[PDB]
Amino acid sequence: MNKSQLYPDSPLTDQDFNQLDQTVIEAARRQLVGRRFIELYGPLGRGMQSVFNDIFMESRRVNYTIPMLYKDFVLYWRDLEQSKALDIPIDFSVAANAARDVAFLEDQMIFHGSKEFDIPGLMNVKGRLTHLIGNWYESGNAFQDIVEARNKLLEMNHNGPYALVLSPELYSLLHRVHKDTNVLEIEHVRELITAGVFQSPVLKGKSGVIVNTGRNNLDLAISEDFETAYLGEEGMNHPFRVYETVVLRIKRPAAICTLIDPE
Amino acid sequence: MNKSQLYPDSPLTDQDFNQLDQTVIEAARRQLVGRRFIELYGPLGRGMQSVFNDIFMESRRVNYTIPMLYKDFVLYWRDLEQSKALDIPIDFSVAANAARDVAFLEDQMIFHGSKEFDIPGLMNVKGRLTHLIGNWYESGNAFQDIVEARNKLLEMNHNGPYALVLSPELYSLLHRVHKDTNVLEIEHVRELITAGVFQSPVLKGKSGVIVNTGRNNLDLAISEDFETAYLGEEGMNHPFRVYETVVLRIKRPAAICTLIDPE
Amino acid sequence: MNKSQLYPDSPLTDQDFNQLDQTVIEAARRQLVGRRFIELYGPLGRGMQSVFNDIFMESRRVNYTIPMLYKDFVLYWRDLEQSKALDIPIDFSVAANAARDVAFLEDQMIFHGSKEFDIPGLMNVKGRLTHLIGNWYESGNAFQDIVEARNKLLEMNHNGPYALVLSPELYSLLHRVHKDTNVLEIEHVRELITAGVFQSPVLKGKSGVIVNTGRNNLDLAISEDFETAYLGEEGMNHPFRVYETVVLRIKRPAAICTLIDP
Amino acid sequence: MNKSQLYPDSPLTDQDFNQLDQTVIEAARRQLVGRRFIELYGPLGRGMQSVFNDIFMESRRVNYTIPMLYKDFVLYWRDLEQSKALDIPIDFSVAANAARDVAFLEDQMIFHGSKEFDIPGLMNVKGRLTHLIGNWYESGNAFQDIVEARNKLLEMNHNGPYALVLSPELYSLLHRVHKDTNVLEIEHVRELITAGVFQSPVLKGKSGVIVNTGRNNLDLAISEDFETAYLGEEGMNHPFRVYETVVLRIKRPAAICTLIDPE
């Protein structure tokens, strides 16, 4: 399936359109936090507009509608025509920005869920464990809270490997320089969490989540990965659409222990 | 030996059945702690239902019956039929869970032995050294206990390399952040134990074990590795069986110094 | 394409499966009432485990999971061997009982919905029109209450053809003679409702429904019709299963008028 | 385009001229700080003497004239003639010095802009965030100032990855050895800034800048990379010119949070 012949009126050729995909894929890759520890359920394809989920509580089956996440960018015709005249590889700076916004949309949908499509997220799924953090500003408390949260996961027949995602404010507190001591608390934490410790701008305030990275616990249902579309001429310009269809499936919500600030 | 023709009625083809083995093998690999420091005695094959062991005490020979460790999972026919209709690579999420449970079964059999089959484990073999740990919550005690346990192994003509396996509670105490100091006690410990320091959920409470990793000291007798079986149609579904036949052989029990909490 | 190769371990030959299929299908046809006035959207195939419904209320898209309705019957090996030895056709009576039960399940799901998957029925869908009927024992009331119900559908921009399904008690009451015309009320109703007046045991008491026939109004989305699948042989006996996967989509809820006893 | 036939009177042959480019390219590479975290807008070529910039403020378009940055060096004819007589690969020590000066010129133009050509730099662009640092000589203040500067970038929909460039005086203070503690403050800082922490001699006094490394935020418009030219015989010698044409484009100035000493 060549995308040049799919959009016969597209101003981009085969070479020009592949670089657009590379710009979109790379820009999204740098910002996707959920994909770093959640496996993909393959390219389900255009023939699947809804995927099934088997929730196990420690086996209810539910239907999830795969949602669209998209953002549009416009490539000016004057800039495009100049590029072909001079034979230069075209500027896709806006495409990277559009791909980043879609990548942020996926992370927001992964961690907080689709309210309108009724899809639970990591931080609000039903049946997950909950741990109340202490004052992470103090030494040892952050590691102690992770251990207690990990202990809650352990008493569920969930031996790991775990992945911990924290808000930027909690992430900074983990790496902060203490006064009395000189302990890098991420070094102690990263030994217990082997799948990786990440920060996500989606999480707000003081919040975090520990997830078992097994494919059996949760995965990402992908009907169409990050793809670039042509919307046709509009005002002589060339608006495009970076879209993706993905729904998070949480088969075993008990493998999630969200850390929440007691306020 | 192609597994598609071995089960002529199996719904999975050659390609579909290989991905099942990959899912089972990888999921087991992530959870097998004993295999990380215990060598395998090859594929003994189906012709050996019992393996001999020569115990040396510092040469009694005993017969060990190779036990079966298995767990069953069911692939729904509706999900399978949909996968072939859409030509998608089939979901083996349950297979990973079944393989993980078998992997946990092997680790429980390796460390605690088969009570019914009369096979000693690492933590209850006859003739091994025993060390009583102190308060690992204090700085330096955990390293001191390992040194004393290692010294006991040294005064047996057992120069290493050693492997230390600890319970999750002891593993956390090793990596904990101390108040007065900022010592990462795993860094001091990991220098003496070169074959690796692992944690196993099988060990409960405050317990651990130091094992010489030599093939002459102990090994794993494998008659059949992690293999996936088809049990035939049952209620129009497709139940499978992830089974493995393995017995731990401890040729020199004196190469084991189990750490036990004095309670 | 014969079921003998589909189930090599089955004890039935090509002809025996064929006789099994007619036994199941014929018993289903004699009991299926909803299929008489509702078009069939399919067979979609095994690749459709859930269908999409676009509700045009008088637009909202709802995802419906296709339910699987089944019933199990067992053929005894001694009976099959005895019939085979004596050159007597196999007795598939239990198959008809299983097929009849599944046919009732489909009719029950069509009319009263399926609470397990939250699929609405003819008498349960939101947005339908409700008509409070009177005492049909008295003359003239039976025909008039249908006229007002049809007028309700006419006011909602639905001009037929209509299909009327009544409870078995109410269907008999429609056989009375008209007070003035001296003609049975059923022929007056049949001229107003040209898609047929049916009866169904699923409706109890004074109940009924008027449905505007048409694919754009409502249809049956099936992925597999009445099919007999041979389960594994257990205990030397042969258990079977008559199953089907059907879901009812009501695209225009306002095209359904329900007669409700006050 | 062979450079030997481009300058028919050049004393260097094809082999002799390629080593000149390698000396210039490598010497420039060791000193270019801006190129370590700013992407290039390809070889725009000689047909583009001015490049367009679309400034987004959180979309004004401006025209930037691509400037020339060059430095001249002289290869003595006596040294050149001796090299060919003995068949030795010629000394290009001066060429490395000339390339280094041009590389310093680019970094000065990237961080402080072209005053005469009216091109804003990283440290004086219009619409960028500004943070006032504290006493970096004290422990924790340097990390705290980076976090606050990063927090300012975060409240602009700028999630990273960030690149921090500091003056040599600030760079030394970051790596300094404290009295009361033994904290290496670069280790804490380098976790938040993933694209890298660099020092630039261009920045004077106590100054720094945090830049989002996205191609959409800023990039380097290159009309001609580091190229070596022959200026013809002058006094029987061979003067050359190491020139490059490059202009920095800041599409989103809000992605820049310059750290400035309150004096």
Give one DSSP letter per residue of D197-226, joined into a string.
Answer: EEE-TTS-SSEEEEEE--TTTEEEEEEEEE
Please report, for residues B45, B46, C236, D38, the alpha-carbon distance to residue D117 in angstroms, rounded to integers and kept in the order given. Answer: 80, 82, 95, 21
Q: What is the largest CA-CA distance in chain C?
A: 67
**Which residues of chain A have a CB within 8 Å of the CB of B79?**
52
Resolution of the deposited coordinates, in angstroms? 3.1
| Cα C223 to Cα A107: distance, rounded to the nearest angstrom | 36
Amino acid at B13: T
The 10 Å Cβ neighbour count of residue C29 is: 13
Between positions 94 and 133 of B, the ones with CB within 8 A of A are 94, 96-97, 100, 104
Say if CB B95 and CB B25 are below 8 A apart.
no
Q: Which residues in B lie closer than 8 A to residue A192 (C-beta atoms)?
A: 172, 175
User: Which tokens is A164 given?
Assistant: 């911990």
Q: Give D255's DSSP letter.
A: G
Whether the CB-CB separation of D20 and D238 falls below 8 Å is answered with no
Q: Count CB atoms within 10 A of the CB of residue A158.
A: 23
Counted across chains A and C, CB pairs separated by less than 8 A come out at 11
D63 in A contact zone (CB under 8 Å): no
- B86, B96 in Cβ contact below 8 A? no
Distance between CA atoms of residues A21 and A15, nearest Å: 10
Give the chains touching A; criterion: ≥3 Cβ pairs < 8 Å: B, C, D
Q: Which residues contact C131 (CB under 8 A, 6 or more apart)?
A: C145, C148, C149, C152, C257, C258, C259, C260
> In this complex, is the C-beta atom of B182 within 8 Å of any C-beta atom belonging to chain A?
yes
Angle formed at CA C233 by CA C231 and CA C237, multiple of 5 degrees: 115
Q: Any residues with CB less than 8 A from the CB of A245 and at least 6 apart, and which? A: A66, A67, A68, A69, A222, A223, A224
Burial class (CB in 10 A: 0-12, 13-18, 19+), B49: exposed
Q: Name beta bridge partners: C212.
A: C162
Find the helix packing angle between B185-192 and B141-154, rounded to 10°.
10
Interchain touch D–C (≥3 Cβ pairs closer than 8 Å): no
* D93: contact with A, CB 8 A cutoff: no
Phi and psi of C49, rounded to 5°?
A: -90, -5
Question: Where in chain D does DSSP place strands (E)?
Answer: 40-43, 50-55, 60-65, 68-75, 129-132, 162-166, 197-199, 207-212, 218-230, 238-250, 256-260
Distance CA A48, CA B86 (A): 9
C52: contact with A, CB 8 A cutoff: yes
Q: How far apart are CA C76 and CA C74, in angstroms?
A: 6
Cα angle A82, A88, A89 (rounded to 5 degrees) comes to: 110
Q: Which residues of B67-94 are buried (b: 16+ CB within 10 A; e: fewer)?
A: bebbbebebbbbebbbbeeeebebbbbb
Rounded Cα distance between D9 and A7, Å, is 53
Q: After which residues is chain A broken (C to N over 2.5 A)?
A: 58
Q: Return the beta strands (E) in B182-255 as ranges.
A: 197-199, 207-212, 218-230, 238-250
**A221 to chain B: which residues are within 8 Å by CB?**
none
Q: How far apart are the first and last CA of chain C?
A: 54
Exposure b/e, B218-253, CB count within 10 A at least 16 = b: bbbbbbbebebbbeebeebebebbbbbbbbbbbbbb
Nearest CA in chain D to A32: D159
**How far is the first Cα of chain A from the last one, in angstroms, to the nearest whole number?**
53
Is C64 buried (19+), middle (13-18) or exposed (0-12) by CB count in 10 A? Answer: buried
Q: Does A143 touch chain B (CB under 8 A)?
A: yes
